[PDB]
Amino acid sequence: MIDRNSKVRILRKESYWFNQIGTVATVDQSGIRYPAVVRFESVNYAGTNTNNFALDELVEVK
Amino acid sequence: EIGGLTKCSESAAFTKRLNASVKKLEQRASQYEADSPPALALKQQVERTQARFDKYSRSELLCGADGLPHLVADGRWSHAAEFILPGFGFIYISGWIGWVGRKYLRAVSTSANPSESEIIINVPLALKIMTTGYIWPISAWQELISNDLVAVSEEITVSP
Amino acid sequence: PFPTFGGSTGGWLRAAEVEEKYAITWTSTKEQIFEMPTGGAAIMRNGENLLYLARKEQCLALSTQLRTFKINDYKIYRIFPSGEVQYLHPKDGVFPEKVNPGRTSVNSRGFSIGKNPNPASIKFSGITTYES
Amino acid sequence: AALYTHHQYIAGFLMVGAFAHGAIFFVRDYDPELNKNNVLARMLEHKEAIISHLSWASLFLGFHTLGLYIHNDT
Amino acid sequence: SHTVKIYDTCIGCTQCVRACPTDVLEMVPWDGCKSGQIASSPRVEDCVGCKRCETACPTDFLSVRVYLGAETTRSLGLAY
Amino acid sequence: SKNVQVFVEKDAVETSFAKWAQPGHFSRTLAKGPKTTTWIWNLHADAHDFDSQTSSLEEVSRKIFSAHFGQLAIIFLWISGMHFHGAYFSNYSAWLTDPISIKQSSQVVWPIVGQEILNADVGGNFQGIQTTSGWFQMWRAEGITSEVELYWTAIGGLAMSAIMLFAGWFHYHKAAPKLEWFQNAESMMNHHLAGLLGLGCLSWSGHQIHIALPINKLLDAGVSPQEIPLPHEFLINRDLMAQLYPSFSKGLAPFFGGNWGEYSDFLTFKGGLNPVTGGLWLSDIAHHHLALSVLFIIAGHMYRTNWGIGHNMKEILEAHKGPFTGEGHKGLYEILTTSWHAQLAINLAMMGSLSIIVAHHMYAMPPYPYLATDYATQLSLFTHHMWIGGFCVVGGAAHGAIFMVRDYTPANNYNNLLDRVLRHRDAIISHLNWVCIFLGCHAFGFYIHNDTMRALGRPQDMFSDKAIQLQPIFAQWIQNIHLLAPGTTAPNALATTSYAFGGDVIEVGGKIAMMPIKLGTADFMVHHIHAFTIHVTVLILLKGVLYARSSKLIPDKANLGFRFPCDGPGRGGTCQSSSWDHVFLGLFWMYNSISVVIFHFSWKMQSDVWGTITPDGAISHITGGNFAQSSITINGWLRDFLWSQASQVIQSYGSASSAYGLIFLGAHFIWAFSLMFLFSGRGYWQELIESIVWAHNKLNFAPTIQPRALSITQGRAVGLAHYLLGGIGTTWAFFLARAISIT
Amino acid sequence: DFLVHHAIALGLHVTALILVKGALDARGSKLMPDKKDFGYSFPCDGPGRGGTCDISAWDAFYLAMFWMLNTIG
Amino acid sequence: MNDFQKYLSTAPVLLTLWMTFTAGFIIEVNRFFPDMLGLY
Ligand code: CLA
Ligand code: CLA
Ligand code: CLA
Ligand code: CLA
Ligand code: CLA
Ligand code: CLA
Ligand SMILES: CC1=C(/C=C/C(C)=C/C=C/C(C)=C/C=C/C=C(C)/C=C/C=C(C)/C=C/C2=C(C)CCCC2(C)C)C(C)(C)CCC1
Ligand code: SF4
Ligand code: SF4
Ligand code: SF4
């Protein structure tokens, strides 16, 4: 399940980290469109290591 | 012979090349004299030339009309020394290098700083891993049949 | 109220007189030297200042420099050949980087960039996928 | 001599154009849904494999061909 | 001239509107993000096509996309 | 207290190897660590940009001083090696005895893999590579004679190298000067113009007068090297010197008295070239340096330091202002005393310009014994110094632009010359553009016209000395002036400064050393082409300096920096609009310019100067005088020059010149290789890398330092680098191989 | 003849690589996952994300032309 | 010492040393076993 410190696999095809594993940092509960904040160990082509995804775009890996 | 070639031991052109080459060096040596350091060098060079041609002559190499050795690589073991046997050497060494490299990368991947260990190699570990590559053929096969070598669609792919 | 400048060959051309022109205005508390986008150095006046340029970008570039001098009262206008003037920046009085209640969204698509339609689907339509 | 060089050059242009229009097709006329699990779609699924292997082939041929030529020259 | 579109993945970082060289973008009130703000492109008639905005976006894939199109004196940056 | 004092901080930086193990320490960004391959490249590209590594001028200045010591150490080691190789791996002794026959050689290859073929039969019972740097001639002029002496100078070099390296460490880690010390231009100029140059010249004159002159006279006369007295003997026994030069008998008494005339024996103004060696008379060279020494020492007493008398540069600069130039030169002093980049610009441009002058003056007036007849060495030196010069000149422009983007301050430059220049930049660039077009159309048009005419069977309509002729009247006039100068405008001289202007043919060993070089229509055409090439180079470079901070297209270019890839695909396209890119393009034109110049030298000389002359007056030039009617068309250059003079390299296989053939081919390869970086873009490569990485991942392994494609700017740099190496390398081999044969 | 034939092989393979990659990576890539919305030929996608020069499919044709000429040569 | 060893463990330095060693051994082999176009 998506929750703090959980590990998930990205399912957004446009993501640099598609089919890769990241750690959910925090999940906002205010109804924002993309609540989960996942952090990755690899920088993207822009140099970022984090992005916000929706719960459906994330599948828990364990 | 294969391809209408002739054995170098029986090729006149091959011999002509030898004579000509030696003559050139000897003509040069004539200018210098006796034990002059230049002359001694040229003299030693002719010895090497004579040896090279002799080695090729005693070999199974096949020469063409130009009198130059031509190599055969169709799989026949008669001329395996030309390509097959040397080929095994390359494969063994190349695999060794690749296997050990992959091993080190995967090994240091789980370290405190996986990127510092790629720019500043941990020599002690590297040497250990490097020595363990002599049996790379066996290890690789074992890893393949254990589903530990090839990954399974859990890797990043393009948008389309 | 023109700042003190000696002239340059990098000023405006005919377009400024026949197509369109721009103007920036600001107020200073001291006379200081600034660099003008056209090329060269000029001295602003102690008070109101007005300068004419040929492009909006040139005007906004100067504004950036002005902010360094701690001047944030700049205004940019576009003067047409007939004399008509359009106030352009700050448009609503509040700089664009600061959310101002009363501003409506424009050109917004409610989905991720990857949810745009396929080009083949809109063939012979005249519209583009990103406008579809 | 002229005829051979003439047709071979024309052939090259014709070949390159084919691949060019093939790409134009993918960008403009390809329907992902119609060709579901089609022979064409699956080609775009293992694109990396095709490109990577073609790369290896090019490298192998390039290194050894040039290497052998330079050996002979030296 | 050019077309600039903003997507729901915006986070209201304001970085884009702070990078535009010609004031084409603005920050408008919104509720889809924690910041409570989204970017808009009210004045695309002044876009030069620099794409500085895109370079500033922090989202995985740009939430602000600039599609180059018809060219005018303003878009071609012609001072003459 | 004193205006000029020494201020130094003790123990400024601790010496340790810790930072060595922390790559990227100099930069804040790089220090964080490597995450992509770009970090690696950036580490090497920002290594010596101290301005970005620190914000204090004092620190930047300190690093520069120490770094310079490092270069000096390297240079000393280089010179040391050359002398050593000339002592243990050379045929100097044999050449010294018979300079005309034996060929110079100072490099020998080990007998590995048939590479021994490269060891040629140069002569003197020695086999090695024929060197072309001109060391032997220089050593002879100095009066070396032995190989023991060469060994000792080598040892001195090593020692000096070490001293410099210590100095670098000392003045950075133990005694680092403060900024106030560095900012003392008047003192520095006084010291460098009187001590470094003045005392240097005087010291050299001493060696030439007491050691070189006497020994060389004996050598020329015929005395065997072994029979010539050792150098110290001449210094002690005045009688020996008196025999050669009969004025040393009088001693230094004439000097302290005003009778400097008595020293006419060794201090002379003969002019021309020594008939025996084919080089300038050493007596004249001695007077040259002595005279220059006096001038420099006097000049070193022009600026104020701590005694009131002197000039203050600031005052001089500020006073020089006029009706058309506003505040004039006000503000320049501060710029040149607070910006290293500005100083480098001027200094680098002048240094490069000097190299080009050296190339011209060193062939027309051969300075060393037995150099002119060695065509290989002559060609090598001319081309070498021509190149060094071109690079330096372009570099000056580059650093000038870095100044405008990083150090220029509008406040300190109001209505000064710089400001006024940047205020009419459009006019300057517009006019230069026209000048370039005019020259280019007219100059190159001449060649195209001629080609068409000759091909159409209409030779009478060509711009040739046999048809419509374009004679260089002005130059022809100056030549006559210089020819008739000796005895008229230069009464005390005895001969022309150079035989190029006019005179007789000086021959040494049956080979022509110098001969009057005439100028005709072909020369006019080529000279004007040189003008076109240089002018275009200036356009690109100057545009970069003037439009470095801003432009109508990108009004805020300054903030973007000196080296940015672009501003975007907008405004119709803003690719390559940085000042760095202007330098990038300028180098290509510099390559073209220098290439044409060196080719002109090679063909003109081999056609109208170099060659052999019989005992009677029969001159046979190497190429036969083809330059006049063949260099007037492009086909001529392709056939009578490149195609014909390349017969040597292409047919070098199986000989000691085989290396040149291989390098010729290798250089072509590298040149072509570069075109893939210059025509392609990062996007294609990045995507290809993605697919390749997929493969590695599919096998469960991939680098943490994610592989990325080279940056846009780096791509251009890599391309230019390989392009230049390949082009220059090709000519290098072509020239050297051809020269060896012609010699 | 052996060597020259292998050189021709290199040409065909490398020319093909450029062209094939262009076709497959014409509807999108990791650098530009939305390439299909820009078309067959576009200048670039900006100086960001590392630099996106020659990223369109048209550029593949442009690059392949040179190799085609080389191989035919 | 430890720090110096780290510098000597840097990628550039190690490559040069390794390649020098590799080059050397290849050269030495050719010095003692020269002119070979096949395993005899
Ligand atoms: C052979 C290749 C070639 C040629 C011909 C040119 C030509 C030119 N380059 Mg160029 N360039 C080249 C390669 C070449 N480039 C390469 C490889 C690079 C990469 C580094 C560059 C980079 C470069 C830069 C960065 C600059 C130039 C500039 C110039 C122009 C100089 C002005 C001039 O002399 O106009 C004359 C042009 C001629 C071609 C002369 C010959 C034409 C005939 C003989 C004259 C008469 C013809 C008449 C006008 C019309 C005839 C009618 C009929 C034929 C239809 C000129 C258009 C400069 C420029 O534009 O400033 C002015 C400039 O800044 N070049
Ligand atoms: C039956 C053959 C055929 C047909 C019908 C088409 C048809 C088409 N192609 Mg195509 N193409 C072909 C062969 C063909 N092509 C081949 C063989 C190639 C490989 C080179 C290409 C490569 C290609 C590309 C790369 C592109 C097209 C495009 C197009 C479309 C627009 C063409 C256009 O805008 O041109 C308009 C008219 C012109 C361009 C005039 C051409 C002027 C040429 C370039 C210069 C002439 C040479 C020179 C002047 C000679 C002077 C020398 C003298 C001094 C001696 C159109 C549907 C374009 C497209 O987007 O389609 C979607 C596109 O981008 N094609
Ligand atoms: C002389 C010019 C030249 C050369 C040599 C190359 C070489 C190459 N290009 Mg290329 N290219 C060029 C001009 C050139 N290009 C130009 C002008 C363009 C503009 C159209 C392009 C456009 C282009 C594209 C679009 C692509 C290439 C690709 C390639 C590579 C193909 C694979 C290959 O041959 O591997 C072998 C490579 C070489 C032999 C060259 C390097 C050789 C060095 C010296 C190493 C030699 C090692 C030696 C054998 C000994 C090794 C052991 C030793 C360490 C002890 C190769 C590196 C393709 C690529 O990326 O590859 C997959 C590709 O997609 N090029
Ligand atoms: C400009 C400087 C210079 C240059 C270019 C050369 C060039 C040459 N010299 Mg020479 N030399 C020089 C200065 C120079 N020398 C000086 C100053 C001296 C006086 C000491 C000598 C004394 C000298 C002798 C006595 C001999 C040469 C020889 C040679 C030739 C073979 C070089 C060699 O050893 O290859 C082979 C190279 C090696 C054996 C060195 C091994 C490679 C090392 C290990 C790589 C470096 C490791 C790396 C830096 C690690 C970094 C660690 C970090 C702390 C930096 C070569 C042409 C030889 C020759 O011509 O014989 C016929 C020869 O016998 N030279
Ligand atoms: C008369 C005194 C004197 C002399 C000879 C020099 C000489 C030099 N200075 Mg200098 N300097 C001086 C005073 C002097 N300076 C003063 C007073 C200041 C402060 C205002 C400076 C500040 C200064 C800076 C900031 C820099 C120099 C640099 C240089 C060098 C320029 C490079 C060159 O030409 O290489 C020629 C090289 C040589 C001739 C090699 C020999 C060099 C030694 C040190 C000569 C010393 C005298 C020598 C032992 C002979 C003694 C005579 C005896 C045998 C009888 C050069 C060695 C630059 C440099 O690269 O420094 C490292 C530099 O950046 N100087
Ligand atoms: C007195 C000479 C001198 C000095 C002190 C400097 C000093 C400087 N220059 Mg500069 N420059 C010079 C001459 C000089 N330059 C000349 C002559 C040119 C024209 C080509 C330039 C062009 C130039 C540009 C275009 C730039 C600089 C920059 C810089 C700064 C950083 C340098 C850097 O990145 O270090 C790192 C140094 C390197 C990476 C160089 C390594 C050598 C490379 C790999 C080429 C090697 C070629 C080699 C000889 C070929 C061997 C062939 C063999 C392998 C077969 C620094 C202040 C840069 C800057 O940012 O300034 C603020 C910058 O952008 N300079
Ligand atoms: C009879 C015979 C023979 C033959 C055999 C065979 C069977 C062969 C084959 C061959 C082949 C089989 C070839 C092929 C080729 C192919 C190609 C050349 C292809 C191309 C392709 C393309 C170009 C593509 C395109 C595209 C794209 C890109 C995408 C999609 C769309 C399109 C389709 C457009 C032999 C030898 C003689 C001998 C015996 C008998
Ligand atoms: S492309 Fe440039 S002008 Fe257009 S919105 Fe982005 S930053 Fe502003
Ligand atoms: S930079 Fe991107 S995420 Fe930030 S406000 Fe602009 S569009 Fe939204
Ligand atoms: S990536 Fe290349 S084409 Fe695109 S904006 Fe940058 S420099 Fe221009």
Return residues 23-52 of C near E (CB < 8 Å).
none
Chain F partners within 8 Å of C6 (Cβ) = 326, 415, 423
For residues F273 and F267, give the distance between their C-alpha atoms in angstroms, rounded to a whole number.
16
Rounded to the nearest whole angstrom, what is the distance from the C-alpha of residue G51 to the centroid of ligand 9? Answer: 20
**Which of A14, A32, A48 faces E33 most closely, judged by CB atoms?**
A32
Q: Does A12 touch chain E (CB under 8 A)?
A: yes
Q: Pull the structure tokens for residue G55.
A: 């990223």
Say if H and G touch: at least 3 Cβ pairs within 8 Å.
no
Instruction: Name every chain D residue with its beta carbon within 8 A of the beta carbon of B157.
Output: 48
CA angle D11, D15, D17 (to 5 degrees): 120
Classify each residue of F217-252 as buried b or exposed e, where b means 16 or more C-beta atoms within 10 Å of its C-beta: bbbeeeeebeebeebeebeeeeeebeebbebbeeee
The reply to whether B35 sits in an annotated binding site is: no
Name the minimum distance, in Å, from the CA of H14 to any CA of chain B.
8
Q: Is F108's C-beta closer than 6 angstroms to any atom of ligand 4?
A: yes
Give the integer Cα–Cα distance in Å for F210 and F199: 16
Confirm if F541 and F584 have CB atoms less than 8 A apart. no
Q: Which residue of A has its CA nearest to C115?
A: A14
- Residues with CB under 6 Å of ligand 10 are F 565-566, 568-569, 575, 712; G 43-44, 46-47, 51-53
Length of chain D: 74
Distances G65 to D54, F164, G21, G70 between C-alpha atoms, Å? 18, 55, 14, 9
CA distance F418 to F408: 10
Q: Which of F660, F669, F694, F697 to mutate to test the interface with D (most CBs of D within 10 A)?
A: F694
Give the whole-angstrom CA distance, residue F274 versus residue F221: 12
For atom 2 of ligand 9, the residue with the nearest CA is E57
Closest CA to E70 of E40, E52, E44: E44
* Residue A12: strand, helix, or coil: coil
- 82-101 of C, contacting G, C-beta below 8 A: none
Interface test with G, best of E68, E75, E76 (most G CBs within 10 A): E68
Residues of C in contact with F426 (CB under 8 A): 9-10
C39 in the Ramachandran plot: left (φ > 0), alpha (ψ -120 to 50) or beta?
A: left
User: Distance between CA F126 and CA B38 in Å, rounded?
Assistant: 6
**Cα radius of gyration rounded to whole Å, chain D:** 19
Instruction: Provide the chain E residues 5-64 that lie in CB contact (below 8 A) with chain A.
Output: 8-9, 11, 32-34, 58-61
Neighbours of F625 (CB within 10 A): 14
How far apart CA F161 and CA F157 sit, in angstroms, is 6
CA C60 to ligand 10 center in whole angstroms: 23
SS3 F89: coil
Give the integer Cα–Cα distance in Å for F383 and F385.
6
Q: Which residue of chain E comes nearest to F552, CA vs CA?
A: E79
How far, in Å, from the CA of G25 to the mean position of ligand 10? 19
- Is F17 at the interface with chain H, CB within 8 A? yes
- Tell me the backbone φ, ψ of residue E59, rounded to 5 degrees: -70, 155
Considering only CB atoms, F550 lies closest to which of C33, C39, C54, namely C39
Note whether F735 and F597 are within 8 A (CB): no
Decide: E56 and E34 in contact? Cβ < 8 Å: no
Nearest C-alpha neighbor of F107 from the set F82, F124, F125: F82
d(CA F41, CA F31): 14
| Quoted resolution (Å) | 3.2
A11 in B contact zone (CB under 8 Å): no
Chain C neighbors (3+ CB pairs < 8 Å): A, D, E, F, G
D32–C contact, CB cutoff 8 A: yes
Q: Do G61 and D16 touch (CB under 8 A)?
A: yes
Distance, CA F588 to ligand 1 centroid (Å)? 13
D48: contact with B, CB 8 A cutoff: yes
Chain B residues with CB-CB distance to D47 below 8 A: 158, 160
For chains F and G, what is the number of CB pairs under 8 angstroms?
A: 68
Q: For ligand 5, what atom is nearest to the CA of residue F168?
A: 62
Q: Kindly state if the Cβ of F404 falls inside 6 Å of ligand 1.
A: no
Under an 8 A CB cutoff, do G46 and E67 touch? no
Contact flag G53-F564 (C-beta cutoff 8 Å): no
Structure tokens at F352: 């490069």
Question: What token pair was written down for C48?
Answer: 């109101």
The distance of F392 to chain C (nearest Cα, Å) reads 28
Q: Among residues F252, F286, F253, which one has the least CA distance to residue F267?
A: F286
Find tokens 């809109």 and name the residue: C122
How many whole angstroms from its chain centre is CA F394? 12
**3-state secondary structure string across F268-319:** CCCCCCCCCCCCCCHHHHHHHHHHHHHHHHHHCCCECCCCCCCECHHHHHHH
CA F428-F433-F434 angle, 5° bins: 105
Tokens linked to B14: 């091959």
> How far apart, in whole angstroms, are the C-alpha atoms of residue G15 and residue G65?
8
Alpha carbon distance D17, D11 (integer Å): 10
Angle between helices F521-546 and F375-406 (to 10 degrees): 30
CA dihedral D56, D59, D61, D65 (to 10 degrees): -160
Min Cα distance C114 → chain G (Å) is 7
Residue of C nearest to D27 (CA): C119
Q: E79 CA distance to ligand 2 centroid (A)?
A: 34
Cα–Cα distance for residue pair F143/F141, rounded to 1 Å:
5
Query: Which of G30, G31, G45 to mutate: most A Cβ within 10 Å?
Result: G30
Going by CA atoms, what residue is nearest to atom 20 of ligand 6?
Answer: F395
Q: Please, which residues bridge with residue C86 across strands? A: C78
- Tell me, yes or no, whether chains F and G touch by having 3 or more C-beta pairs under 8 A: yes
DSSP F151-190: HHHHHHHHHHHHHHHHHHHIIIIIEEEPHHHH--HHHHHH
* Cα–Cα nearest to F366, from F272, F484, F503: F272
Distance CA F418, CA F453 (A): 49
Inter-chain touch B158–G33, beta carbons under 8 Å:
yes
Q: Could you tell me the distance, in angstroms and rounded to a whole number, from the CA of residue B107 to the centre of ligand 3?
A: 32
User: Side-chain half-sphere of C91: how many Cα atoms within 13 Å?
Assistant: 16
CB contact under 8 A, D26 and G26: yes
What are the DSSP calls for F322-377, one per residue?
-TTSTTTTTTHHHHHHH-HHHHHHHHHHHHHHHHHHHHHHHHHS--STT-SS-HHH
